[PDB]
Design a binder for this molecule. Sequence first.
Ligand SMILES: *[C@@H]1O[C@H](CO)[C@@H](O)[C@H](O)[C@H]1NC(C)=O
Ligand SMILES: *[C@@H]1O[C@H](CO)[C@@H](O)[C@H](O)[C@H]1NC(C)=O
Ligand SMILES: *[C@@H]1O[C@H](CO)[C@@H](O)[C@H](O)[C@H]1NC(C)=O
Ligand SMILES: [Cl-]
Ligand SMILES: [Cl-]
Length: 443
Amino acid sequence: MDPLCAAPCSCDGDRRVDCSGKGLTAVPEGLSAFTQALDISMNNITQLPEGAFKNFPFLEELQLAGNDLSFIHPKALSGLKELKVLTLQNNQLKTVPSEAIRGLSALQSLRLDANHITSVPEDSFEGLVQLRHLWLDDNSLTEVPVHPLSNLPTLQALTLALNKISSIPDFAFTNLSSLVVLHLHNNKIRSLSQHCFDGLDNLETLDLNYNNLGEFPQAIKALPSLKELGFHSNSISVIPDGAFDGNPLLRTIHLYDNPLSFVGNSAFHNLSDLHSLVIRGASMVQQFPNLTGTVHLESLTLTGTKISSIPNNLCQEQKMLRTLDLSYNNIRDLPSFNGCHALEEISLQRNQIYQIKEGTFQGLISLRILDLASNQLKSVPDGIFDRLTSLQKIWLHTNPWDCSCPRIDYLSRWLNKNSQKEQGSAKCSGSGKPVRSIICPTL
Ligand SMILES: *[C@@H]1O[C@H](CO)[C@@H](O)[C@H](O)[C@H]1NC(C)=O
Ligand SMILES: *[C@@H]1O[C@H](CO)[C@@H](O)[C@H](O)[C@H]1NC(C)=O
Ligand SMILES: *[C@@H]1O[C@H](CO)[C@@H](O)[C@H](O)[C@H]1NC(C)=O
Ligand SMILES: [Cl-]
Ligand SMILES: [Cl-]
């Protein structure tokens, strides 16, 4: 028995009390009023009466998750003027308890997720002059609670994810000037009004994944601080030129699981902080994306297009490239790769490459993986693989290799000496013999 505590709870030396999972039906008695954190989650507190926390006026953290809480008296949380964190997720609240939280003027974090909230009273959040994080995810909201959110200029993170929001009107978040993170994933958003995000000048993260967007949202043009954008698993068919004109600081764009058939040639131009670009199955794309000003790209994947040409300045403009996958397009001519000193992984399988020019592989000192399978290569220049000191694995098979001597001399001898590196077998057109097995006559 702890004299400075109270059974069945547990107390530490820093005024933190753990009374979680003890079958409690009420707020514990016998504890110090100077208690700073109270964890009473995972109990059986189905209701909080008037004066519930009368003995905890100095409380800073309160965890009430995983009870089956369905009612909070308007006066249950009276006196909690030091409360910074309130945790209410995984309960049976049907409405936002606006009355009960009105006097919580020090509150910085409010978790209301995983309840069954269908409505937000128009006066919700009015007293929360310090709120920084608001979780309203995993409920049954059918709209953005516009007027309640107008009360929170200090808010930095908001989630309205896993609800049933179908549209967002003009100026829905306009008072949220401190907002940095906005989650709207797993709703049914089909309509974003032209000015729905106006006022969110500090927003760095927007998550629109798993929605029902068709037209690409022009509304994101009002997001100058945007660094991370997710709109994967929607119904977007085209990413137009100018799409990211308002977002020069974008580092991350998740755009997969969309029926993307076309992307504008300049859609990803002038994005100096963009780290990676992965676009697959945009079948109507014919020209290589204009990436002028997009100089910090470390990874690029472009597959399933009609692209037949790669710009010669690729390894100049995109010098930081570590990973390059341009497989399953229609490429015939390759650029020089000399400027790509950081390139570790290259995939060019299933194109129409018929030649490599001499001395275009000399700068590839970091190259570990080289995939040239399923092309139209009959030959390579002598000493093409000379400078590939980091090379681990190479694919050369499914090419019509001309095994005439002395044309095949270098490659046959290279593949023999470097047999551990070759994956599958480059074979001679006609005879079907492995290229490594050919010994050309010598002087
Ligand atoms: C929770 O409290 C209710 C009402 O007092 C009670 O009927 C129920 O048995 C409790 N649930 C438990 C102990 O799991
Ligand atoms: C929110 O911003 C609008 C438009 O700028 C303004 O009219 C209104 O006063 C603000 N609402 C507040 C501070 O509650
Ligand atoms: C792109 O951005 C850079 C830096 O802000 C600027 O130099 C250029 O004028 C912009 N527009 C272009 C290249 O069309
Ligand atoms: Cl449930
Ligand atoms: Cl990557």
